[PDB]
Amino acid sequence: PRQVLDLEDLVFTQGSHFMANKRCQLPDGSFRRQRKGYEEVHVPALKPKPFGSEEQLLPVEKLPKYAQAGFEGFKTLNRIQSKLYRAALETDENLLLCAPTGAGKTNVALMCMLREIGKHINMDGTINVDDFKIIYIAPMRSLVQEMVGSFGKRLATYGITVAELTGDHQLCKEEISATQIIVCTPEKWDIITRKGGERTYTQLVRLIILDEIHLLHDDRGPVLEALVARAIRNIEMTQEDVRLIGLSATLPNYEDVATFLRVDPAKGLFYFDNSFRPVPLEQTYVGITEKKAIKRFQIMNEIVYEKIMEHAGKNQVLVFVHSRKETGKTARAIRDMCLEKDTLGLFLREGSASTEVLRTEAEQCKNLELKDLLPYGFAIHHAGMTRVDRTLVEDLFADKHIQVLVSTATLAWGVNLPAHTVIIKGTQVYSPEKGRWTELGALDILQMLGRAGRPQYDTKGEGILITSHGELQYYLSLLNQQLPIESQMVSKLPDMLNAEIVLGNVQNAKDAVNWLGYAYLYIRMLRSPTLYGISHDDLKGDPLLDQRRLDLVHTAALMLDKNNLVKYDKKTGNFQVTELGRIASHYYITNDTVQTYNQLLKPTLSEIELFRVFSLSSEFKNITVREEEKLELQKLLERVPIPVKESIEEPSAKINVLLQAFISQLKLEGFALMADMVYVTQSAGRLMRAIFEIVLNRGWAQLTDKTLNLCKMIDKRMWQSMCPLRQFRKLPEEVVKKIEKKNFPFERLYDLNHNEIGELIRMPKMGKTIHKYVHLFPKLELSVHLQPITRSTLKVELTITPDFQWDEKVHGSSEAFWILVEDVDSEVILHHEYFLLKAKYAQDEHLITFFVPVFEPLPPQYFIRVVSDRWLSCETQLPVSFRHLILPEKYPPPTELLDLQPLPVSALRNSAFESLYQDKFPFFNPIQTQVFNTVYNSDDNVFVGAPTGSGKTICAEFAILRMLLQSSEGRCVYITPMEALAEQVYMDWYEKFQDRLNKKVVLLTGETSTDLKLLGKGNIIISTPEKWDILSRRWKQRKNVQNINLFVVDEVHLIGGENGPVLEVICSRMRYISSQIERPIRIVALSSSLSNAKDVAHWLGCSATSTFNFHPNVRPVPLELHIQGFNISHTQTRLLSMAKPVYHAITKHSPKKPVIVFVPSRKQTRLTAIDILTTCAADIQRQRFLHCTEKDLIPYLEKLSDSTLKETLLNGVGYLHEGLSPMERRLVEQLFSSGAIQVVVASRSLCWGMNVAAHLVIIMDTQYYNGKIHAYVDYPIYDVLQMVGHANRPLQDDEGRCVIMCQGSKKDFFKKFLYEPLPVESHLDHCMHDHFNAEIVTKTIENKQDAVDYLTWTFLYRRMTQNPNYYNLQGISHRHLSDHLSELVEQTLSDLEQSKCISIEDEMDVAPLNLGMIAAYYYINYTTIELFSMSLNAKTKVRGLIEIISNAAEYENIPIRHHEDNLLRQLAQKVPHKLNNPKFNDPHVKTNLLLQAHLSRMQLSAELQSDTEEILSKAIRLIQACVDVLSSNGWLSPALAAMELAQMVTQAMWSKDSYLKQLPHFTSEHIK
Amino acid sequence: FSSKTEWRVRAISAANLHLRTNHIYVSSDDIKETGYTYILPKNVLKKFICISDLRAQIAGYLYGVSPPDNPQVKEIRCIVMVPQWGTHQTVHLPGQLPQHEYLKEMEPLGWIHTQPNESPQLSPQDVTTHAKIMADNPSWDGEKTIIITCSFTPGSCTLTAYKLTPSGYEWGRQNTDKGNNPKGYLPSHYERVQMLLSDRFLGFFMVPAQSSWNYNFMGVRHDPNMKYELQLANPKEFYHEVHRPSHFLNFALLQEGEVYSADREDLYA
Amino acid sequence: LKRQEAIAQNRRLTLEDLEDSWDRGIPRINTLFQKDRHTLAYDKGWRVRTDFKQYQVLKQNPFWWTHQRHDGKLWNLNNYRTDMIQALGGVEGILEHTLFKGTYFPTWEGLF
Amino acid sequence: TAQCFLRVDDESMQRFHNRVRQILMASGSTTFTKIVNKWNTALIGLMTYFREAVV
């Protein structure tokens, strides 16, 4: 169907200047005359419309009271403002105000701002500033910088922060997060929406105000059409309404801008013609007729002289010229002509106040050009003169002293100084983007001619517009409502389509056609087909114009896949975003420019070739080198420091030497050459950043050093060999050139004193300032801790230490760095990542953990360069040296699935044993067939390393059936590392082994008194490692710990995580017991598939024939694991940018099959369960995730407490987190297991506890905010492996898919550790002191020699010889191993004797003291009782005792998440004891507040009582430890205080309250 | 030199020195079979060719070890770039030999230097340089230390390692004539030794710590008795920004510039 | 390499850049400066035709393996004549055998 | 790594001796310069193909 269009045929080549009208019909008294070489066309001052008989200027005392504070100084309103105060304050309609320029359109924008400000009034206060944001999109940047001042003055009484979007993308997202009125250009807001830095605050954007929307006609038109199509499309998809207020000039096709803005033409459309202009302007048009341009220039100077002399003494004149030099040139030219014809005194008559203020203001002036003119009436105002001098011109013109101001266009945007007469001299500006002298825009002319007539003094404006005669009809159509607003989007349609492809707003060509229907191009193509290349034959054959939008989308997509921006198949029409697409969208570079950077960027490019690759950009395709500047270019080419391979009459050499002449700060002289230089450098910022991102993404380290340096050299405007103290602009340049003259390295300045610096520069006056600025310069000190994970992968833990004083005026809210880890050649980046050093977290170390690959020619080093993203010569290189790096051995290959014929259940022996496997499955899976004869039909220790979902718990059950064959009063002990896994296997085996085999299955809980009974009475003893640790610590006493017949350890691959040393200690103890008790304890270790499974086999006594270590590809349902990198370093931005790819992964990978979406937090699951639904309701497939009917959901929906869970479940997406009840959790799991719903959005901590498995598992954002260190720590790979193993439906599914959306920094870390088996390493050497104390009180460790002899039983000893450098070893020899173990034991026993937990006699023999017996009895960390016996005195009390118990190190693993601080501060003002120095980053004061809130039985948030139940589980053993330490210390009263604390923490009451709050349902009415 | 635009065409030429690094030739003739063998790894050879100049000679001190149970072969494991400047026929290295704790595990195996074009003989300036370094540093054993010359042939590089004979060390120690043909200079003053390349292992580089290695533009800042620490880094190119600071630093400052510039708003930034 | 440097500098190669490698290479550099570039560039498969010329022309064909317009001249035989004149005692040494002094010509260079 | 040794085969030498015998079939009325030119043609056609292997 698709037909490729000629996309440059359909554009309007004039751009902002295209006239859609053929005729221009003028007002009535509007003569024209051919005078002499010019035709003068007058158009008279339109009489204002006579007032409607029931229409009046309402005062500000009639608009509502919240809006009265904005209109200060205003008694009444304007007429245009009075016509639509009811549509801007009382109605939430989208507006399109088409008023004349200068007719008070910004107060209309203020009215809409006051409506959106007046929805957050906060009755006792003034404004709830953080529930809303208002975007004010104004076309020019100086208009933005003065709208910031205007809205900052008017909204000052509301406390509303108005600011301008400028700076880098981090500065822009910080300015969006800090402010309410965000005033920006269309391009800046569009580049923020493309890069994504507003995505967290687009639900907060409730009002965008498009100032000067007749920029739709400009060549900047596609930016506004993309912005409004994106906002209107998000209104139609996301269904959160934003209010669009388009302010326009009165031009035709205003009803098409109304349809474009979704403005209803009854309520929202307001078209005020030029009669409603406040000071009605008589407009004169001088169109110069003759055809020799020097005579045209002389006639133009004669006309500005004649029209100046027409308003000589009567009125002020504001002449508007194109250049800054032309300003003084024609000011002095009309002054020389007035002095020539002796008419100079007509401006300044002897009005001696006026001319004396002018004379004494001239002699004060520093501008020698302005001092030439100010004694007479004349003055100049460009942006190049001083702020003092140009505001002197502004204030001298506002006081009617300057008779003739001459100015550039910027005054017309920057200042609201209007004059009586304005005279636009020339209408010809040199635009370098076209590379030629083009006409003035519609925007600049309408703004320059809005300054005609001041609203205070003038009854009539006068605007003379001196033009060429062929260009006369354009401005007559422009200023008299006859220049139609036509879309320029076909110019930039592939770039806007690429921006919608990159953002994921369009996916296939149908969604791209849908987006193109929201553009202004579609409405203009519907209303005017002929102008846009459509015949009426084609509109009659396609009335909604869908085939033309398909043709435009297909043509733009052919431009996109030809330039490799989009993978576009013509088969299905689908788009795939390329990383060149992301870079071109993020940095606005055109599709031809990224095709140039795809062809031309090689890894081997020098700095010479990099300027050449930059200079061949398609942004500079119109830059030609003219001969009139070639001489000057040669004077640059002999002075620029990077050589140019081209000849200077080729344009690329011109762009090259103009960029280098910018960075060198060479003074240029040609106006065309300075304009081309300003253009190529304002493009060079984004172009060099796009080259840097292309080169960084492909991994080229030398070119990414060159390109990042060149970004910072273009930005800072200095070469990198210059002093870094030029980036502090507050220094004198003479002392900086004295530093560069005395060329030592800049790092020499760090070691010196402020005297020593000042005498090294010979500037002892400047020395203290140089010292302050050298210590303000960003400087990170890096330290590396590298640990070999496998032979291929290292884990580098890079600690970054800020060694510079932070200062907000130079650094800002954040300093951005790049961490580049590269090989010995520094030509491949092995790992780059962005690093935000935030201003809260200076002066403290940042742990950045990542994984780098190591290849078979083992390199001598890697290099970690942490460079600044913004600062030149801010780079710290650190050589990660691999000299003494002992890589682990290349691990043995996994045991293969021998293709056994699948095992029937009759291969099991006993009939009762098959009677619990008959109806489940007829044949076992091939893992169980291979593992069966060793587990069931043998008696060896068996390691089964199989992926999660292979059914290794049935191998545990094989071992249990063997143990129940040997004698029926046997005893399995089943250890699972997670308590929810223990609950799940208890629910499985109580139905399996107790109901059908009548063997007692017990599950151990945290009470030692009842666990001995449960172990004595049970045949299958389910446990967690910490519940079996407290039993097995006294295994000499407990006979029931000794004569167990089988010890199954599920998931020993969790030995390399947190709560993993305890699992290692209990399996090492269960092997050590088995070495001593006349009868071996048969260990069956189940695990995920390990790489180093020979070490777990050798540690648990498994054979080489009984070690079934399989591969991750061996699974019964094959896993298809896709990993999606999201290169968004900000994590809420990444987490919101993942929300639509979650739904797209659901639609691509499992449309009609179950989905689990694992999310980082308790609060992210509700948001993602709603974002899946808003995206499926954005499409027409609403309720596509509900595979049952709502007939069937009401018995399951009426049970729940969370109402939004019912809102999401009725549309088919449930969600799960910790804060739900197991009521709601089990019922959502039952709705999901039955297939009634399709998506369940589960939290990250529910990966272990889910009795459900899906077809697709999406893992959104594998990081989570550890608020104790204020960093986003990555998921441990055991959590990700369990999440992946939830994509396992054995019978229902042929495959199991898992889409891991992760940050691209973490992408290769998952491409390693999920397909290849798992390397587990013991972390016992950091968590050692507990188990050493426990084996000392058992008298297992009686001397330090037996401490080493006990340590030989661990996994730590087995892994110190296979991966030594993980454990700070230097060899596997007996000397290295023995002395490292001896240093380990003599460090931990020094820590235990210094804690007074043990006692060391003869420096060799250890013995348990009192504190060690207390610490190993009730399972407390040794440092907690080190704190207890040091921190309990004889006079402590329950007021301080909760501070003692809350300071226990059993509470350091309480979670601090984000948004946890201030409601804890709200908890710090209520609870019955205050906290001296409470820092709400502390876990301990959080547990103090939560203990007090449990004792005061206060209401809590659900996520905080989720942690209070975590606290109170360990509280009671801590209080018993307090009881026992004060028992041994001999203090009656603190011991009785602790015994009181034990009973009140169980009954949740206070001591200073009476003793009946204990009873249920008794509140303070009963006390009173 | 011409010093105004000679370095511009030289800089451009040196920007393409990575094309010389896949066309490498080793002169496998005149090799006496009874000495050591030298394995120069191709990564530091590639990096050393890229950071060089086609005309001015750069030089790096070679450091290396011998492999386990093969003492007759010498794996060069390090090229130490030091502060040097070089003409087209010699390299003026400083008097201080490279001292660092990473070069204590290795022994000095001599030096590598680039040549502008291939000569069939060792330069007399090279044997005087090698013998002065040997006479001033007793850690330079004349049996094991070599001079690799990477001569820039057309579109390629020809590498030839030479050793000093005991005649050559005595002559080059006593020599003062710094010309291209000094008296008493014979081709018995050197012997070509076997040198070969390697993908199997990787070398590294040592650059100076405070400054960088190329003093050909900073020629007055280079003293023969200068002192330098080292740094486990990769060396910059010959025409890198930090090596020619007078090309980037002698600019007049922007004094009353940008006052008659162009008004163009950076809309995106 | 010189062609790659010549394209980027907008330079056409002349005899100044190729006078140092004259008559060196297979094929010869002389074929680059022939008038028939566009004509001889369209002649593909000339060597097997040159070998099969022996089945069409009755004369024997030395140099069947080469052609002068494509590969150039692969030898130089003027040094042989120069060393032949030099080694035979010079022209005055040769002309004693040749009955020249009976012919009353004072020089040799003006004769034919 | 290795050495390649070149020789001229017997068939080329027999073909050259055939060419010598064809030159020796010149008549008595044939001038000497034609015989010498045929000999020089055969010698160039031998040597310029068998350049290194004749030695």
The Cα A374–Cα A357 span in angstroms is 10
3-state secondary structure A1367-1431: HCCCCCCHHHHHHHHHHHHHHHHHHHHHCCCEEEECCCEEEECHHHHHHHHCCCCHHHHHHHHHH
Query: Which residues lie below 8 Å from residue A860, measured CB to CB, with a gap of 6+?
Result: A824, A881, A882, A883, B77, B202, B203, B204
Tokens 């380290």 found at:
A701
Measured CA angle at B66 (ends B60, B70), to 5 deg: 150
Where would I find the H helices in C20-74? 37-40, 46-51, 68-71
3-state secondary structure A328-355: HHHHHHHHHHHHHCCCHHHCCCCCCHHH
- What is the helix (H) or strand (E) element at residue A1547, kind and residue range? helix A1532-1547
**3-state DSSP call for residue A28?**
coil
**3-state DSSP call for residue A606?**
coil
Radius of gyration of chain D (CA): 15
Does the annotation flag A654 for ligand binding? no
Report how far apart, in Å, the C-alpha atoms of A11 and of each of A15, A487, A491, A591 are. 8, 9, 6, 17
How remote is the C-alpha of D4 from its chain's centroid? 24
The Cα A419–Cα B217 span in angstroms is 59
The Cα C26–Cα C74 span in angstroms is 8
How remote is the C-alpha of A364 from its chain's centroid? 51
Nearest CA in chain D to C77: D44
Residue A1476 near residue A1447 (C-beta atoms within 8 A) = no
Specify the amino acid at residue A891: Y
Residue A582 near residue A542 (C-beta atoms within 8 A) = no
Q: What is the DSSP string of A442-453?
A: HHHHHHHTTSBS
Burial bucket for residue A1276 (CB in 10 Å: 0-12, 13-18, 19+):
middle
Closest CA to A1063 of A1006, A978, A959: A978
Specify the amino acid at residue B73: V
Residue window 22-51, chain D: list those with CB within 8 Å of chain C. Answer: 41-42, 44-45, 48-49
Report how far apart, in Å, the C-alpha atoms of A265 and of each of A93, A257, A763 are. 11, 10, 70
N-to-C CA span, chain D: 23
Specify the amino acid at residue A405: L
The Cα A1112–Cα A1088 span in angstroms is 8
Tokens matching residue A1286 = 């939830």
B/e letters for B12-29, b = 16+ CB within 10 Å, e = fewer, are bbbbbbbebbeebebbee
- What is the helix (H) or strand (E) element at residue A852, kind and residue range? strand A846-853
Question: Dihedral, CA atoms, B74, B80, B85, B91, nearest 10 degrees?
Answer: -10
Does the annotation flag A950 for ligand binding? yes
Burial bucket for residue A1554 (CB in 10 Å: 0-12, 13-18, 19+):
exposed
Radius of gyration of chain C (CA): 22
Specify the amino acid at residue A549: R
Query: Which residues lie below 8 Å from residue A722, measured CB to CB, with a gap of 6+?
Result: A740, A872, B248, B249
Does the annotation flag A1364 for ligand binding? no
Tokens 């390299």 found at:
B91
Does the annotation flag A460 for ligand binding? no
Measured CA angle at A34 (ends A32, A40), to 5 deg: 50
Tokens matching residue B65 = 């070890």
How distant is the Cα of C22 from the closest Cα of chain A, in angstroms?
28
Of B12, B204, B257, the CB nearest to A645: B12
Phi, psi at residue A866, to the nearest 5°?
Answer: -100, 105
- What is the helix (H) or strand (E) element at residue A1231, kind and residue range? helix A1222-1233
Tokens 């699951």 found at:
A1165
Query: Which residues lie below 8 Å from residue A1203, measured CB to CB, with a gap of 6+?
Result: none
How remote is the C-alpha of A1118 from its chain's centroid? 34
The Cα A1183–Cα A1210 span in angstroms is 8
Which residue pairs from A630-637 have beta carbons closer than 8 angstroms and sit at least 24 positions apart in sequence? A632/A668, A632/A669, A632/A670, A632/A673, A633/A657, A633/A673, A636/A660, A636/A661, A636/A666, A636/A668
The Cα A220–Cα A488 span in angstroms is 8
Question: Dihedral, CA atoms, A926, A928, A933, A934, nearest 10 degrees?
Answer: 120
Tokens matching residue A1199 = 């049970």
Q: Do chains A and B touch (3 or more CB pairs under 8 A)?
A: yes
Tokens matching residue A1005 = 């809980």
The Cα A6–Cα B216 span in angstroms is 56
Tokens 């004369």 found at:
C59
A71 dihedral zone (left: phi>0; alpha: psi -120 to 50; beta): beta
Closest CA to A1121 of A1291, A1293, A1285, A1292: A1285
Strand order in the sheet with A846-853: A780-788, A793-802, A846-853
Does the annotation flag A701 for ligand binding? no
Sign of CA dihedral A356, A357, A363, A364: positive
Query: How many DSSP H helices and E strands does chain C contain?
Result: 6, 0
N-to-C CA span, chain A: 83
Tokens matching residue B32 = 């006496």
Where would I find the H helices in A587-728? 591-600, 607-615, 630-637, 651-663, 671-698, 701-716
Q: Does B138 touch chain C (CB under 8 A)?
A: no
Burial bucket for residue A220 (CB in 10 Å: 0-12, 13-18, 19+):
buried
The Cα A438–Cα A153 span in angstroms is 37
Return the partners of chain B (3 or more C-beta pairs < 8 Å). Answer: A, C
Neighbours of A255 (CB within 10 A): 16
Closest CA to A681 of A626, A617, A629: A617
The Cα C61–Cα A546 span in angstroms is 74
Where would I find the H helices in A1254-1327? 1277-1285, 1307-1313
Q: Which residues pair with A286 in a beta bridge?
A: A40, A466
Measured CA angle at A1108 (ends A1104, A1114), to 5 deg: 145
Q: What is the largest CA-CA distance in chain C?
A: 68
- What is the helix (H) or strand (E) element at residue A1142, kind and residue range? helix A1139-1149
- Interface C–D counts its CB contacts (< 8 A) at 11
The Cα A666–Cα A45 span in angstroms is 49
Query: Which residues lie below 8 Å from residue D52, measured CB to CB, with a gap of 6+?
Result: D6
**3-state DSSP call for residue A473?**
helix
Radius of gyration of chain A (CA): 39
Residue A95 near residue A112 (C-beta atoms within 8 A) = yes
Q: Which residues pair with A1023 in a beta bridge?
A: A975
Q: Does B257 touch chain C (CB under 8 A)?
A: no
**3-state DSSP call for residue A1067?**
helix
Tokens matching residue A704 = 């990414």
Residue B120 near residue B265 (C-beta atoms within 8 A) = no
Measured CA angle at A998 (ends A992, A1004), to 5 deg: 70
Q: Which residues pair with B24 in a beta bridge?
A: B157
Return the partners of chain A (3 or more C-beta pairs < 8 Å). Answer: B, C
Half-sphere exposure in the Cβ direction for B257 (13 Å, CA): 15
Tokens 């003119």 found at:
A373
SS3 content of chain A, % helix, strand, coil (to 5): 45, 15, 40
Cis peptide leading into residue C27 (ω within 30°): yes
Of B241, B249, B267, the CB nearest to A141: B267
Measured CA angle at A341 (ends A338, A347), to 5 deg: 35
Query: How many DSSP H helices and E strands does chain D contain?
Result: 2, 0
Tokens matching residue A1127 = 């290169």
Residue A557 near residue A566 (C-beta atoms within 8 A) = yes
Residue A1107 near residue A1077 (C-beta atoms within 8 A) = no
According to DSSP, residue A397 is labeled: H
- Interface A–B counts its CB contacts (< 8 A) at 155
Residue window 183-212, chain B: list those with CB within 8 Å of chain A. Answer: 199-204, 210-211
**3-state DSSP call for residue A1109?**
strand
Tokens matching residue A573 = 């029409």
Strand order in the sheet with A1119-1126: A1119-1126, A1296-1303, A1256-1260, A1155-1159, A1239-1243, A1213-1216
How remote is the C-alpha of B115 from its chain's centroid? 9
B/e letters for A153-172, b = 16+ CB within 10 Å, e = fewer, are ebbeebebebbbbbebbbbb
Tokens matching residue B159 = 């590498």
Q: Do the strands A317-320 and A421-425 form a parallel or antiparallel pair, or are they unpaired?
A: parallel
The Cα A1422–Cα A1412 span in angstroms is 7
Report how far apart, in Å, the C-alpha atoms of C25 and of each of B22, C2, C18, C35 are. 22, 16, 12, 20
According to DSSP, residue A829 is labeled: E
Which residue pairs from A984-987 have beta carbons closer than 8 angstroms and sit at least 24 positions apart in sequence? A984/A1249, A984/A1251, A985/A953, A985/A1022, A985/A1050, A986/A1022, A987/A1251
Query: How many DSSP H helices and E strands does chain A contain?
Result: 60, 43
Closest CA to B228 of B75, B63, B61, B87: B61
Q: Does C58 touch chain B (CB under 8 A)?
A: no
Measured in angstroms, the resolution is: 4.6
The Cα A1508–Cα A609 span in angstroms is 62
The Cα A1240–Cα A1154 span in angstroms is 8
Burial bucket for residue A684 (CB in 10 Å: 0-12, 13-18, 19+):
buried
**3-state DSSP call for residue A782?**
strand
Nearest CA in chain B to A824: B204
Q: Which residues pair with A1258 in a beta bridge?
A: A1157, A1299
A323, B260: Cβ pair inside 8 Å?
yes
Residue B188 near residue B167 (C-beta atoms within 8 A) = yes
Phi, psi at residue A1211, to the nearest 5°?
Answer: -95, 0
The Cα A9–Cα B161 span in angstroms is 65
Residue A803 near residue A779 (C-beta atoms within 8 A) = yes
Sign of CA dihedral A528, A532, A536, A539: negative
The Cα A1484–Cα A1454 span in angstroms is 8
C10, A645: Cβ pair inside 8 Å?
no
Tokens matching residue A109 = 């924008």
Neighbours of A843 (CB within 10 A): 10
Residue A182 near residue A176 (C-beta atoms within 8 A) = yes
Residue A625 near residue A633 (C-beta atoms within 8 A) = yes
**3-state DSSP call for residue B251?**
coil
The Cα A655–Cα A625 span in angstroms is 9
Neighbours of A1521 (CB within 10 A): 25
Residue A216 near residue A227 (C-beta atoms within 8 A) = no
- Segments of A1221-1279 assigned E as strands: 1239-1243, 1256-1260, 1263-1266, 1271-1274
Q: Which residues pair with A248 in a beta bridge?
A: A98
